[PDB]
């Protein structure tokens, strides 16, 4: 689990969105596994606006933050799960790192701010849904 709290927005994995998120919906995209809802309180996270390919992510299944090198956001095939059929997910970045299903939502960050959140994984890989192109999160 986990979210990004920037301005009056809450960014979560679409597959983990709550009823309150759907009832206060700002934007959602199944192909990216992202959903953004509105918040009453202002958040403290800042979004990175950069082309970093190295950063650090939080892994809840280890209670640890790990440094990683990650691929550029791309269209990657994701196998069928209990949340989606087998499909291509867009704006996804892959890295070598530990992950379990419940790790979704952990933040990936670089020196400039939040880059994205954990969205896929398995067998010593971890995938992050990028948010750096969502310029509207800053206003
Ligand atoms: C997060 O790490 C792991 C580790 C092992 C397995 C998994 N499951 C995983 O990738 N998916 C299940 C949740 C929805 C994901 C998606 N974005 O389509 C696919 N995740
Ligand atoms: Zn950066």
Curated annotation (Swiss-Prot):
Q: Which cysteines are joined by disulfide bonds?
A: none
| Residue sites binding Zn(2+) 1 per the record | 50, 52, 110, 112
Could you name the active-site residues?
A: 15 (for protease 2a activity), 33 (for protease 2a activity), 104 (for protease 2a activity)
- Stretches that traverse the bilayer: none
Q: Which domain of life is it from?
A: Viruses
- Name the reaction it catalyses: Selective cleavage of Tyr-|-Gly bond in the picornavirus polyprotein
User: What functional role does this protein have?
Assistant: Cysteine protease that cleaves viral polyprotein and specific host proteins. It is responsible for the autocatalytic cleavage between the P1 and P2 regions, which is the first cleavage occurring in the polyprotein. Also cleaves the host translation initiation factor EIF4G1, in order to shut down the capped cellular mRNA translation. Inhibits the host nucleus-cytoplasm protein and RNA trafficking by cleaving host members of the nuclear pores. Counteracts stress granule formation probably by antagonizing its assembly or promoting its dissassembly.
Question: Subunit notes for this chain?
Answer: Homodimer.
Protein's recorded name: Protease 2A
Can you name the source organism? Coxsackievirus A16 (strain G-10)
Q: What is the lineage of its organism?
A: Viruses, Riboviria, Orthornavirae, Pisuviricota, Pisoniviricetes
Q: Which residues of the full protein are shown?
A: 869 to 1007 of 2193
